[PDB]
Amino acid sequence: MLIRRLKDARLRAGISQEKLGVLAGIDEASASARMNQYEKGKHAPDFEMANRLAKVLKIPVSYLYTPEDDLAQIILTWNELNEQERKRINFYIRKK
Amino acid sequence: MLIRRLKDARLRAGISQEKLGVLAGIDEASASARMNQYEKGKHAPDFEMANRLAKVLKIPVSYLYTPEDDLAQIILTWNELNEQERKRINFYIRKK
């Protein structure tokens, strides 16, 4: 997991390390210590935990794994496009 | 990691489970057994291993973590766009 992606997305959500961890199913007593390990890159969550984090954060989960800043922006923005404008840009890309 | 993403990308590369594992730094004696665990979803690699896999497979690493088929296609295709056509579609998206 890339730590900047997790931290940026948490701060956009307006929630603390603890609340993110508790909503993602970490025991309350461990939640802030565990989230801080993740956010400092001390160790990384399993994919199942990342999905729970992404659902709390309302982002596509692969945003957390995208090292390319410009691709990460596409992911984050796509997340808020309608079905017409998704399929729109889909075929901008499907020609390449 | 999503197993379909890893398998699709390996088969596009034209290489076996063993060769993928060996190039990604797994010991030769374990390489095919380990890769098959990953591809069957029996357990999942750490992010550092996923990055080594992605570099062998010549894909952006977050392709392996993207459950949305249409977003995964954007990732895969972006991977083969030039700097002008990357920045092109960048601003198709930056207006949203």
Q: Structural class per helix/strand content of chain A? A: mainly alpha
What's the number of structural domains of chain A?
Answer: 1
- What is the string of helix and strand elements of chain A? HHHHHH
**Largest inter-chain interface?**
A-B, 32 and 32 residues
Protein name (chains A, B): Csp231I C protein
InterPro entries (chains A, B): Cro/C1-type_HTH, Lambda_DNA-bd_dom_sf
Organism (chains A, B): Citrobacter sp. RFL231
GO molecular function (chains A, B): DNA binding
How would you sum up this structure, described in words?
Chains A, B: This is Csp231I C protein. Chains A, B: Pfam families: HTH_3 (PF01381). Chains A, B: Residues 6-64 form the HTH cro/C1-type domain. Chains A, B: One of its GO terms (molecular function) is DNA binding. Two copies of one chain form a homodimer. With 96 residues, chain A is mainly alpha-helical. Chain A has one domain (1-96): 434 Repressor (Amino-terminal Domain) (Orthogonal Bundle). Helix content of chain A is 66%, strand content 0%. The first copy, chain A, contains six helices and no strands. Chain A has helices at 3-13, 17-23, 28-40, 47-57, 69-78, 83-93. In chain A, helix 2 (17-23) crosses helix 3 (28-40). The two termini of chain A are 29 Å apart. The relative contact order of chain A is 0.14. Chain A binds chain B through residues 1, 44, 46-47, 50, 60-68, 70-71, 73-75, 77-78, 80-81, 85-87, 89-90, 92-94, 96, and chain B through 1, 44, 46-47, 50, 60-68, 70-71, 73-75, 77-78, 80-81, 85-87, 89-90, 92-94, 96.
